[PDB]
Ligand binder design. Sequence first.
Ligand SMILES: Nc1ncnc2c1ncn2[C@@H]1O[C@H](COP(=O)(O)OP(=O)(O)O)[C@@H](O)[C@H]1O
Ligand SMILES: CCCCCCCC
Lengths: 342, 20
Amino acid sequence: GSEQESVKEFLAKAKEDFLKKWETPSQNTAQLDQFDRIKTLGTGSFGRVMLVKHKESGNHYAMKILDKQKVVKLKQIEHTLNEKRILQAVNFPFLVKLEFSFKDNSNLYMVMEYVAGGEMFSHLRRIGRFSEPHARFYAAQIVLTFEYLHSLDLIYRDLKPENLLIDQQGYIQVTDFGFAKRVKGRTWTLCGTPEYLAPEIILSKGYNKAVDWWALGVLIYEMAAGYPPFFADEPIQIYEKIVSGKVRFPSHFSSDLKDLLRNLLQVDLTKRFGNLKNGVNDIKNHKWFATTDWIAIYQRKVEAPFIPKFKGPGDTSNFDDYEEEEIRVSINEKCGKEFTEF
Amino acid sequence: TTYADFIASGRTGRRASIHD
Ligand SMILES: Nc1ncnc2c1ncn2[C@@H]1O[C@H](COP(=O)(O)OP(=O)(O)O)[C@@H](O)[C@H]1O
Ligand SMILES: CCCCCCCC
C-alpha cells in the first residue's frame, strides 16, 4: 500500500540522518556556569534531573546529572556512553530533544528541553485510570516511537509511565535512554523495571526488540486498569507471575483491548505481536486501533484528551518535591579515561 | 478488589530501574 511505502521512505531518510550523527557525535556544547540551577524535577537510577535556566538566552531546560564515580562503581559506563550517543543522534516528535551535553571533573551533564506537564505516572496515579480512548491516544504515540527506534536498530528498554512526560499540548515525550542500545541481533543484559520486564529477560535467554513490545503491553494495561498486570511487593514474586504466563483482565476491558493485550503479553516470542512477519503492522492494524489516524497522530493533529496546566515559564507545579542536594565538582579529575568520548 | 490490593501494596510509588 501507498501509506506504507510513505512510511518506508520517511524511515529510510530518517536512518540517513541518525547515522550521520551516530558516527560524528557532539561533545562539550556548554559549561555548568552558563546555567542557573533551580529545582530537582525528579531522580532516577544514579542521577538526578534539575530545572535549570540558561543564563544567555533566558531558556529553561532540564539537566540530567551523573556522578562519574557512581556510574563506574555501578558498572554503567557503557550504558551512559550509549545514552548520550543515541540521544544526540535521534529525532522524532515524541522523543525529548537533547540541547547540550558536557562534562567536568566529577560529572556528566545532559541538557534537554524542559517538558512541564509532569510524568504520566503522576496524573495516572491521581486519576486512578485512563479511559480506553485516552490510553489509546498515548499508546499510539509509543507505537510510532518504537517503530522509529527499532528501524534504527535501537532497543529502548525502560518503558514506564515514570519515563513518559506530558508536554504543553498533551502529547508525550519519552525520556531516560539510559538502557537504550543499538544492536543488530541479540542482547543479554539484565535491566529494566521489574513490573515491565519481558519473560525472556527474567529468564536470561538472550533477547531482542520484542521485549519492547511486551512492555508496551504492560503500559497499556496499566494505563487502562490503573494497576500493572503483575504486581507484588518483592520483585521476585513479580518475576514469577510474569513467567507463569497468566494475566487476568479487568471486567471493564473491551474485547478488542484484551485481544490486543493477550497478543502483546504473549510469552512466546514466536507468537508475540511486533515480533512476526507483519511486524508493527500487526499492531497498527489491530481492531483496538481502528479509529487511530496514525498520520494525524504523527503530525500532532489530534486533540489531546488532557492538557496539563502550565502557569508560567519555569513552573514546576506538575512535579513532586525532592530534597535538593549540592553539586560538587572536584579540583581533581575523577575517571577521565573511562568517559573520554562523552 | 484488585485495585484495593494494588493501593495497599508496597509498589504504588515511582519504581526504579534495575541492573544486574
Ligand atoms: N526533559 C525533562 N523534562 C522534565 N522532567 C524530566 C525530563 N527528563 C527527565 N525528567 C524527570 O526526571 C526523572 C528521572 O530522570 P531520568 O531521565 O529517568 O534519569 P535517571 O533515572 O538517571 O534519574 C523523570 O522521571 C522525570 O521526572
Ligand atoms: C514511523 C513514523 C511514521 C511516518 C509518518 C510520515 C508522514 C508522511
